[PDB]
Amino acid sequence: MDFRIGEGYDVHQLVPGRPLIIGGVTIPYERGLLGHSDADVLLHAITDALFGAAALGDIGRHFDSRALLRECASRVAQAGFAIRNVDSTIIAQAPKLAPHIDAMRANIAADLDLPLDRVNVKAKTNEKLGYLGRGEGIEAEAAALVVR
Amino acid sequence: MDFRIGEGYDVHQLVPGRPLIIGGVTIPYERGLLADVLLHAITDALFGAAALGDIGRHFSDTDPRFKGADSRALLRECASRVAQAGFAIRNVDSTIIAQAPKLAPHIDAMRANIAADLDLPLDRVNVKAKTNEKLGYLGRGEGIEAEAAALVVR
Amino acid sequence: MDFRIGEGYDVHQLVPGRPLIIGGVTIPYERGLLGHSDADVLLHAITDALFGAAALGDIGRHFSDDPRFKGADSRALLRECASRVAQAGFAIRNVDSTIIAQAPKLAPHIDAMRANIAADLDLPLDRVNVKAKTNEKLGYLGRGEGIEAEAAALVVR
Ligand SMILES: [Zn+2]
Ligand SMILES: [Zn+2]
Ligand SMILES: [Zn+2]
Numbered sequence: 506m507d508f509r510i511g512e513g514y515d516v517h518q519l520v521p522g523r524p525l526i527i528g529g530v531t532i533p534y535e536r537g538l539l540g541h542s543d544a545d546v547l548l549h550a551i552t553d554a555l556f557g558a559a560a561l562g563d564i565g566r567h568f569d570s571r572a573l574l575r576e577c578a579s580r581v582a583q584a585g586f587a588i589r590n591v592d593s594t595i596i597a598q599a600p601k602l603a604p605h606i607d608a609m610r611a612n613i614a615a616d617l618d619l620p621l622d623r624v625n626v627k628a629k630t631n632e633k634l635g636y637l638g639r640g641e642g643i644e645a646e647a648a649a650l651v652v653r
Numbered sequence: 654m655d656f657r658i659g660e661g662y663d664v665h666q667l668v669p670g671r672p673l674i675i676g677g678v679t680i681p682y683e684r685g686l687l688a689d690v691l692l693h694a695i696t697d698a699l700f701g702a703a704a705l706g707d708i709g710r711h712f713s714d715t716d717p718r719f720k721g722a723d724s725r726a727l728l729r730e731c732a733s734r735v736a737q738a739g740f741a742i743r744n745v746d747s748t749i750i751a752q753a754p755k756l757a758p759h760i761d762a763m764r765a766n767i768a769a770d771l772d773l774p775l776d777r778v779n780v781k782a783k784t785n786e787k788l789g790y791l792g793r794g795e796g797i798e799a800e801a802a803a804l805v806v807r
Numbered sequence: 808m809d810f811r812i813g814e815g816y817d818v819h820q821l822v823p824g825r826p827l828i829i830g831g832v833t834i835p836y837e838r839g840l841l842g843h844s845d846a847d848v849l850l851h852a853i854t855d856a857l858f859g860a861a862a863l864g865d866i867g868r869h870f871s872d873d874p875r876f877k878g879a880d881s882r883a884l885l886r887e888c889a890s891r892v893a894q895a896g897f898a899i900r901n902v903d904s905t906i907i908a909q910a911p912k913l914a915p916h917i918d919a920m921r922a923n924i925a926a927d928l929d930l931p932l933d934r935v936n937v938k939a940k941t942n943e944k945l946g947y948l949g950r951g952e953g954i955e956a957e958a959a960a961l962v963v964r
Contacts, residue, residue, distance in 0.1 A: 509901045510658055510812055511936070512959035517943050539943075553938055557903035557959070563938035565914065590657040592701035603709065623657070627697055627707035632665050632687070634790045636945045648660040648701075648802065648959070658812055744811040746859035757867065779813070781855055781865035786820050786841070788947045802814040802859075802959065 506652075509586070511558025513647040515549040519640060527595060527602070527643070528609025528626060529571045529616075534600050538643060545570035547595055547626065550645035551613065552577045554593075558651040559586045574616045586651040590623040593647040598640045602628040654806075657740070659702025661801040663693035667751075667794055675749060675756070675797070676763025676780060677725050677770075682754045689724035690799040691749055691780065695767065696724075696731045698803040699742065703735045728770045740805040744777040747801040752794045756782040808963075811897070813860025815852040815958040821951060829906060829913070829954070830920025830937060831882045831927070836911050840954060843872040847881035849906050849937065852956040853924060854881070854888045857899065860962040861892045885927045897962040901934040904958040909951040913939040 523537025528547045538544035548570040556563050559581045581588065591613065595602055606626050614624040631637035637644060671685030676692060696708050712719045712727050719727065735742065745767065749756055760780050768778045785791035791798060825839030830849045840846035854866045869891065870876050870884050889899065902924065906913055917937050925935040942948035948955060
């Protein structure tokens with residue numbers, strides 16, 4: 506009954522010459538996300554939500570973004586926590602994300618050793634507003650529930 | 654003891670020539686949303702907690718089953734789907750971010766609409782109001798955002 | 808087993824001539840956050856998440872941007888928030904949060920922020936978390952026009 510919640514945020518710029526990788530899925534696109542890692546904004550947001558729920562700090566303190574997510578899960582477990590569920594949203598004007606959501610969920614559940622029914626990924630546009638609306642970047646946000 | 658959490662986001666442009674409807678409430682104002690940003694966010698948080706995908710998967714602008722549906726009917730159908738999936742709703746919290754108009758006078762009405770649609774006691778539904786301190790498109794009154802969190806249990 | 812969750816958001820402009828106070832920490836810097844109170848964006852977001860979890864409205868309902876709160880210490884506001892949440896019958900189980908800022912560097916101050924929040928909520932450190940982010944050079948955040956914070960809280964009645 507010792508439940509905890511975590512919340513995470515990430516954003517990266519969309520630039521020429523990078524592959525677009527979100528939720529571990531390589532999505533055909535003219536630009537990709539800019540970062541030191543592969544810049545997987547969704548996995549990063551979920552990673553931060555998991556560190557937050559476990560009160561283990563953040564991705565900046567601790568560190569392929571799937572390997573990092575798998576290591577995050579290891580650290581959460583090390584602290585005595587079990588992951589109960591993850592929910593998330595990706596915000597991008599383009600490209601279309603719906604065809605790729607199922608693969609992302611499958612990847613996240615594998616990396617977190619969760620059944621598919623405890624993992625969720627939602628897709629949003631930003632209604633043409635802000636840097637998101639202009640296609641300058643992609644945001645992700647996440648929530649995680651854990652228990653010790 | 655099988656609890657789950659969900660989170661939701663929505664945003665729309667604020668322009669003259671549309672009514673302003675938030676949380677099922679029509680608010681007198683010179684501009685409107687181009688589109689109930691609060692109900693959408695809550696709807697998405699509930700689907701998320703149940704791991705049922707999102708509002709786009711359930712209620713396609715394509716689908717004829719829901720053409721013209723009010724954001725409240727969609728919220729009600731969301732809740733029915735959440736229950737059949739085996740989940741009971743424990744609470745909802747949310748924030749509306751808008752530079753104008755003032756939203757405090759309307760909060761109890763929004764809470765009442767949401768609690769009704771989700772068949773929840775009023776004290777398990779919360780709506781919070783923020784400005785964006787004149788920063789960004791929110792700050793310029795070009796759009797309004799909402800965010801939501803939901804706790805459920807199977 | 809009567810758990811509830813809350814979520815919070817805040818933002819303030821970054822301006823010359825103001826103290827920069829985040830998570831109760833006074834951070835040396837040429838600019839500070841603008842607000843009616845001390846404009847502690849992180850404590851405000853956490854305060855809203857707590858009121859939200861307890862279904863008690865928001866920081867605007869409880870602490871109106873009244874001369875009673877000009878210059879107000881946002882740690883005193885957070886403690887009063889916690890007092891009201893407890894009066895409503897709720898116990899706090901944990902808090903998580905994120906600060907998004909182009910500058911200054913926040914990592915050196917995070918542990919102090921966590922300690923302040925934990926003291927104010929009468930929680931052990933291992934139930935309080937503060938994460939620091941940049942906005943990867945995007946938007947008004949990327950231009951340093953303001954600082955955002957967001958929070959999540961779990962409580963139980
Ligand atoms: Zn990232
Ligand atoms: Zn919407
Ligand atoms: Zn504030």
